[PDB]
Amino acid sequence: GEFVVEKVLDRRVVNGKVEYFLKWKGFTDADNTWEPEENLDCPELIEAFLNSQK
C-alpha cells in the first residue's frame, strides 16, 4: 500500500540507509512509522524537515 504522509517528525541512519519517522495524513499521529528516503516520494517534507533542524 502507498499511503499519504502529512510530514516528517525525526530522522536516523540504519544499515547505511536513511529512515525518517513520519506522521501520516491517512493514519493517526501515534500510528506514525519509520520509512526510508528510498520509499519516500516526499522531497518537500524531507527538505522542510532539514530546514527545521537548521
Binding site: 499519504v4 504522509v5 513520519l22 495524513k25 520509499n39 519516500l40 516526499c42 518537500e44
Partner: peptide, 15 residues
C-alpha cells in the same frame, strides 16, 4: 490547497 505527499511502507528490507 491540499498538500498531499506519498510514501510507501517498507514491508521488509532488501539487504
Amino acid at each position: 490547497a491540499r498538500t498531499k505527499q506519498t510514501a510507501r511502507k517498507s514491508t521488509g528490507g532488501k539487504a
